[PDB]
Design a protein around this ligand. Sequence first.
Ligand SMILES: CCOC(=O)c1cn(C)c(=O)cc1Cl
Ligand SMILES: CCOC(=O)c1cn(C)c(=O)cc1Cl
Length: 114
Amino acid sequence: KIFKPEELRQALMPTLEALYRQDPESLPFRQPVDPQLLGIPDYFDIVKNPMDLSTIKRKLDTGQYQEPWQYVDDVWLMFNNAWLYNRKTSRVYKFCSKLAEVFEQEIDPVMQSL
Ligand SMILES: CCOC(=O)c1cn(C)c(=O)cc1Cl
Ligand SMILES: CCOC(=O)c1cn(C)c(=O)cc1Cl
């Protein structure tokens, strides 16, 4: 079996809600990184394809995903960007690692139900 495109929001939104529920860990991920505002002006020199929770949520609300892998792909893009840009000792890097642990715990039982 599969999750059809029209089933994606109902099946996958709880995994995204679980990320948002992590506070403070999700806070650096809720909106697109604004390099000038955040005092990290080299961000787009390092990160080629930004991704954040608000973008994923909009795509999941508005039918922009056709298959589960596309949602999962954007989530890992968001995490990988943060592990790439931020130092291993940094708050954002460590928050990213916590969110990834939460994501794995939430997405695995959903995808393994198929
Ligand atoms: C996936 C449900 O969305 C949230 O849980 C959520 C969404 N936004 C846009 C927020 O700013 C905060 C939360 Cl908690
Ligand atoms: C809202 C504050 O966000 C950040 O400070 C931040 C977020 N991300 C995802 C980064 O990769 C780097 C920073 Cl500095």
